[PDB]
Ligand binder design. Structure first.
Ligand SMILES: *CCS(=O)(=O)N(c1ccc(C(C)(C)C)cc1)[C@@H](C(=O)NC1CCCCC1)c1cccnc1
Ligand SMILES: *CCS(=O)(=O)N(c1ccc(C(C)(C)C)cc1)[C@@H](C(=O)NC1CCCCC1)c1cccnc1
Lengths: 304, 304
């Protein structure tokens, strides 16, 4: 019993975080095998941050320009290349602590653990979701860029996020580890605004199923509904359209609670139309949408 | 910028979790040096769980009765002793991964990271607080007992909590690692109820300071107040009395925001008396009290 925002164990990832310094800017890098990954804006000075030419900046630069430290260990740079918005530093030493790892590009609504780091040193771990506008509401201070988001599947670490920047909004944008930004963000000091943030409807339903599983079931109504009828009310409150994919994915939770997906959709409709009236669900006065159906299954099943 | 429920990196602790089996019951144990710590109710059968005599149950038991596994590694038990509600198993092999560790008994309101485990295998990490009634609202399924709560100070792991039981309430009770329960809980299947849970006032103030630091400052009023005047309204809403200790501890946050502790107390009073009116603070429609002043400082400072 109980339901909490739960992050994956960070142990496998802790051993992969290095410090990358290039002149004045210092940030975090990911050391996997004989390659160190970090945001390419490590080569920028506050002069060039307004509209940098990264290809031209990287040309004015050789291996020994870049300083990599793993604690009290200095790594020799054997090569540098730019992959989109990510710098790849080839180093002499393979990381002895390199886990079985994949690079994955996650979809909006999917969740991952962030190991927040400063000077290649892990400070904390928290769970967060890829917002539909391809931002994340994370916790990053200066020097946090190069902090990575990841999932653990079996013994295999899926790296899905590398932190690059804060938008004047105060929310966060980053890349997959192939250096492609999530959303339409560029690595320059320019007027960038995220789109209308919608609510991840399939995640809220997952969270309501978690509430039912943990005895909190006051919001359960005596109605049902249809996808069409529901999606009309979803659009109204800036909720993501609910798909036949999403109903299928909620099947396990539906089966274990004996509450049909459409019945829970009717219960959600009433909450959107009538609010909570000072009531709480799993000790939240708001509807939570940063839990996937898989997050809820894991925590309500007991998956290692 | 940004503010999240952040757990410590779990890496140092991941390497200390073993599986302890004694007959039918299997749970988690903590392997530090040549000692394995686990809840003593591993020696119980559902026969004796109603009113066990643990001294008499432990007497009907020798070293080879207890099965300890570190993955695919079976440890020889050289000794067993009972320390209050904790079993201590002396083993042949010292844990090579044992970190610098302390056992601390934390005070109500203090926070710690929980590494939730099943079969000595870490499943997830989350932050939680010692409630004033000495319970925690955690996330534990069957087989989670022996899961530990900890803080990281410098490179030193402070173990403060070992999970023992769920109360019919659905909240959790456990011990320090010297086997003394937090609160008045006993390790038997009996009608145990936690006391009136109060709100950790000093934590809510810390959280409001975090809100101000992250630009969310609509609730800031044009009044001030006194400890006495405030404590009268605190008692009314089941909030913990605010001490001259607590005001001193909030000093750093007061200094950095330029908001006197008593001004923030006046802002809190209005929220308690008038509610939020459908507004949010750091994206919560409720007042959060599971962040200490030190948690807020760490996350708003950048402490590794
Ligand atoms: C990653 C931390 S940072 O301090 O390096 N940082 C940052 C500065 C400049 C860039 C460029 C891409 C422009 C070279 C990236 C990242 C800041 C940050 O995002 N600053 C922005 C600049 C635009 C206006 C809003 C602030 C940062 C601060 C806190 C957390 N992450 C990043
Ligand atoms: C620790 C998990 S458990 O399944 O072993 N567990 C538990 C059962 C019995 C005990 C005794 C102390 C009575 C021997 C302790 C722990 C349960 C649990 O707490 N069960 C209680 C029994 C009283 C009535 C409410 C349930 C447990 C379940 C989920 C999470 N933690 C513990």
């Amino acid at each position: 019993s109980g339901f909490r925002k739960m992050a994956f164990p960070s142990g496998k990832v802790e051993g992969c975080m290095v410090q990358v310094t290039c002149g004045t800017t210092t940030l975090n890098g990911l050391w996997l095998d004989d390659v160190v990954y970090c945001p390419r804006h490590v080569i920028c000075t506050s002069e060039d941050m307004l509209n940098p030419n990264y290809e031209d900046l990287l040309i004015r630069k050789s291996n020994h320009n870049f300083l990599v430290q793993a604690g009290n260990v200095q790594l020799r740079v054997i090569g540098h290349s730019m992959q989109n918005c990510v710098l790849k530093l080839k180093v002499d030493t393979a990381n002895p602590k390199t886990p079985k790892y994949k690079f994955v590009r996650i979809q909006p609504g999917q969740t991952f653990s962030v190991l927040a780091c400063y000077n290649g040193s892990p400070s904390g771990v928290y769970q967060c979701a890829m917002r539909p506008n391809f931002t994340i509401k994370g916790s990053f201070l200066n020097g946090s860029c190069g902090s990575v988001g990841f999932n653990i599947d079996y013994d295999c670490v899926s790296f899905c996020y590398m932190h690059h920047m804060e938008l004047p909004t105060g929310v966060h944008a980053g890349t997959d580890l192939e250096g492609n930004f999530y959303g339409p963000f560029v690595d320059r000091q320019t007027a960038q605004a995220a789109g209308t943030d919608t609510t991840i409807t399939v995640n809220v339903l997952a969270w309501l199923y978690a509430a039912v599983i943990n005895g909190d079931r006051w919001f359960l109504n005596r109605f049902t509904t249809t996808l069409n009828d529901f999606n009309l009310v979803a659009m109204k409150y800036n909720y993501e359209p609910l798909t036949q994919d999403h109903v299928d994915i909620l099947g396990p939770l539906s089966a274990q609670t004996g509450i049909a997906v459409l019945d829970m959709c009717a219960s959600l409709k009433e909450l959107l139309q009538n609010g909570m009236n000072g009531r709480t669900i799993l000790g939240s006065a708001l509807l939570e949408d940063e839990f996937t159906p898989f997050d809820v299954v894991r925590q309500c099943s007991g998956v290692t």
